[PDB]
């Protein structure tokens, strides 16, 4: 329950994976009607660490370009030369890509990122335990959503092509 700016009560149903993180740069906008980034049948790249280097972001971009599919990059932060590479490839050639900060401050960030990985069918990169490196990315290590909205303040992922049994096991893990 929160306040409403109107005179009447209204119910909002939020489905899928919505989190209060917008795009990192406004150059990723491709739908000017709502000032939002819109992709359908897009790859998802999940990183538990910051993406600040060229070689940590180029191979995923080559998979996304070779498959002619959009890429959503959800990491702790994307800055430095990788952000410039993303913006340059979006503006010059028209590469479909968007970069979104990860939600959560603490172990909640890791848990929600693993939830996104399970729901989309991807793998979390730059983790403390398994230590998967971002220079070694295979096309099966990326999540697959059918739809994504990235606005100024929030991003939402729809119809992630994750394994249903894995999502059920993660649900029972959260229950216990």
């Amino acid at each position: 329950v929160k306040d409403g700016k109107t005179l009447n009560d209204e119910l909002e149903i939020i489905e899928g994976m919505k989190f209060d993180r917008g795009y990192i740069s406004p150059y990723f906008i491709n739908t000017s009607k709502g000032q939002k980034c819109e992709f359908q049948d897009a790859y998802v790249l999940l990183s538990e660490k910051k993406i600040s280097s060229i070689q940590s972001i180029v191979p995923a971009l080559e998979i996304a370009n070779a498959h002619r599919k959009p890429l959503v990059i959800i990491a702790e932060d994307v800055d430095g030369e990788a952000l410039s590479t993303l913006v340059l490839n979006r503006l010059k050639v028209g590469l479909q890509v968007v970069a979104v900060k990860a939600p959560g401050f603490g172990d909640n960030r890791k848990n929600q990122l693993k939830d996104m990985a399970i729901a989309t069918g991807g793998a979390v990169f730059g983790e403390e335990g398994l230590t998967l490196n971002l220079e070694d990315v295979q096309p099966h290590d990326l999540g697959k959503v059918g739809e994504v909205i990235v606005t100024k303040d929030d991003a939402m992922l729809l119809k992630g092509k994750g394994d249903k049994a894995q999502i059920e096991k993660r649900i029972q893990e959260i229950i216990e």
């Binding site: 180029v58 971009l61 080559e62 370009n65 030369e81 590479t85 490839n89 050639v93 590469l95």
Partner: protein, 100 residues
């Protein structure tokens, strides 16, 4: 000694032209300009006559004009010739050659 654009290097100094920086990867991903460092690959455009390492004779330099060479990270002098970028190196500073 061999001159290049009416510039002749002195002693064992070697003048090189750095290769073009990679602007796009093999997968078709364009790279930002300020993220591309100095190119360690270069070609030899001018050599000096060489120094006198032994007694009474001049020792020619190891590389020749047209050799494809590998350069160290530091130790090169900026030389501008016809408003075009060139770099001057000592003969011993050059790491190796690309043979064909």
């Amino acid at each position: 000694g061999q001159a290049f654009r009416k510039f002749l290097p002195l002693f064992d100094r070697v003048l090189v032209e750095r290769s073009a920086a990679e602007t796009v990867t093999k997968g078709g991903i364009m790279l930002p300009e300020k993220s591309q460092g100095k190119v360690l690959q270069a070609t030899v455009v001018a050599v000096g006559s060489g120094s006198k390492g032994k007694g009474g004779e001049i020792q020619p330099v190891s590389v020749k004009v047209g050799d494809k060479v590998l350069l160290p990270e530091y130790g090169g002098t900026k030389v501008v010739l016809d408003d075009k970028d060139y770099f001057l190196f000592r003969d011993g500073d050059i790491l190796g050659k690309y043979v064909d």
